[PDB]
Amino acid sequence: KVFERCELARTLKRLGMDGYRGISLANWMCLAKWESGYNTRATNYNAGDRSTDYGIFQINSRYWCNDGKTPGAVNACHLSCSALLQDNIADAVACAKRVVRDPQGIRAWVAWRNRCQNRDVRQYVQGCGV
């Protein structure tokens, strides 16, 4: 599914993302926006290293979820990458929380550095009731 902006904001808030390990909801919104356009079903193959990015946060198979087909990979979220292509984003949120328990936090995603870091991200949550 492709979430509408405010629907997603509220969905993430219910799932405990607001301020998780210091990360505001608007940061999570900015991440989802630029990773996937708020689209849960997106996959992107990285021909360079044979990994794939999955779902609304474009979580990578090398480190985070198992797809069977990524060489040398591990699965720190202990999920099938299939779990990250559901309309229901509970598993994707749990895995995003796992990512940001590591030292880099939200810097783990390069798109966040490029598109969100050091920016005014207030617009992502404007009017959403969050």
List of residues contacting Cl ion (CB under 5 A): 79-80, 83, 86-88
Q: Which is catalytic among the residues 7, 49, 53, 87?
A: 53
What is the separation of C-alpha 76 from the centre of its chain, rounded to a whole number of angstroms? Answer: 14
Q: Confirm if 91 and 59 have CB atoms less than 8 A apart.
A: no
Nearest distance from C-beta of residue 26 to Cl ion, angstroms:
7
> Could you say which of 4, 7, 18, 35 is catalytic?
35
Q: Is 102 a known active-site residue?
A: no
Helix/strand/coil for 12: helix
> Smallest gap, in angstroms, from Cβ of residue 72 to Cl ion?
20
Clarify whether 18 is annotated catalytic.
no
Q: Cα dist. 123→5, 47, 93, 109, 120 in Å?
A: 10, 34, 21, 20, 8
Least distance from Cl ion to the Cβ atom of residue 87, Å: 4
Nearer to Cl ion, 51 or 66 (CB): 66
Closer to Cl ion by Cβ: residue 87 or 102: 87
Q: Is 18 helix (H, G, I), strand (E, B) or coil?
A: coil
Question: Given the complex with Cl ion, which of 88 and 126 has the nearer CB atom?
Answer: 88
**C-alpha–C-alpha distance, residues 24 and 31, integer Å:** 11
What minimum distance in Å lies between the beta carbon of 79 and Cl ion?
4
Bridge partners for 53 per DSSP = 44, 60
Judged by beta carbon, residue 35 or residue 116, the one nearer Cl ion is 116
Catalytic positions are: 35, 53
